[PDB]
């Protein structure tokens, strides 16, 4: 199936480009080569934005 | 590092491998930016494709 | 939903790490930061491997 | 370009926080390295001393 990560914690947006999400939300990672901020697409909300990589774990 | 640009104009692309986008859409720029066309991920839609560098500026 | 690419042409695996796919196949791109070869996970077959970057377009 | 390593040993991540893998599994590398498994398509960190160039 689609490979995803799962949110370990809620995250509230603080910037124009980050992605808010709730604990347990399934996220498809689009780009994870730029250090601690990964570009993610939420499979719940359809939104796309940067996430703190330490808030997620492989599904 | 995470590099985000913003579209200055609407663009309706001419091939499926180039993104169409709207003015104000934010785009993560990936890879080598030495040409006129840059690989990008849309923060509006999550799609990936090439964009014309003259249509974007740092966000 | 899941953000995907579609194969533009058939491709037959020739190495231990590339991925076979057929024209029209829906693929997840896991990495596309390294240039001419991207890492894909097929949503049609479940297989994973490198693909030529110019063989796919956003769905 | 794409950098592929191969696992020299099995590794079972106690919690599913790092990548679990088997000996012989190939991994794209993008003490701990972020990797994509070419067997499962999963992504996670792996211990660099468990891998060698494929
Ligand atoms: Ni799968
Ligand atoms: Ni979506």
Numbering used by the authors:
A (entry chain A), B (entry chain C), C (entry chain B): 85 to 143
D (entry chain D): 85 to 114, 120 to 143
Mind quoting what the paper says about this structure?
The SH3 domain is a small protein fold comprised of approximately 60 amino acids. SH3 domains are also identified in all eukaryotes as well as in some prokaryotes and viruses. These domains typically mediate protein-protein interactions and affect enzyme regulation, substrate binding, protein localization, and motility, regulating pathways that impact numerous cellular processes, including proliferation, migration, endocytosis, and actin cytoskeleton rearrangement. The founding SH3 domain was identified in c-Src and has been shown to play a major role in autoinhibition of its kinase activity. As our structure confirms, the c-Src SH3 domain structure consists of two antiparallel β-sheets formed by strands β1 - β2 - β5 and strands β3 - β4.
A unique crystal structure of the Src SH3 domain in the trigonal space group H32 is determined to 1.45 Å resolution. Crystals belong to space group H32 with unit cell dimensions a = b = 63.77 Å, c = 271.71 Å, α = β = 90°, γ = 120°, and four molecules per asymmetric unit. Chains A, B, and C are fully modeled from residues 85-143, while chain D lacks strong electron density for residues 115-119 (in the n-Src loop), which remain unmodelled. The two nickel sites are located at the interface of Src SH3 chains A and B in a 2:2 stoichiometry. The nickel atoms bridge the A and B chains by coordination of the nitrogen and carboxyl oxygen atoms of the N-terminal residue Gly-85 of one chain and the imidazole epsilon nitrogen atom of His-125 on β3 in the neighboring chain. Octahedral metal coordination is completed by three water molecules. We further examined the 2:2 stoichiometry interaction between the Ni2+ ions and chains A and B of the SH3 domain. These chains are related by non-crystallographic twofold rotational symmetry, and the interface buries a surface area of approximately 440 Å2 per chain. In addition to the intrachain Ni2+ coordination, the interface features hydrogen bonding between Gln-112 and Thr-87, as well as van der Waals interactions including Val-86 and Leu-127 near the nickel binding site. We thus conclude that the standard PxxP peptide binding to the SH3 domain at the xP and specificity sites is incompatible with the formation of the H32 crystal lattice since these sites in the SH3 domain are involved in crystal lattice contacts.
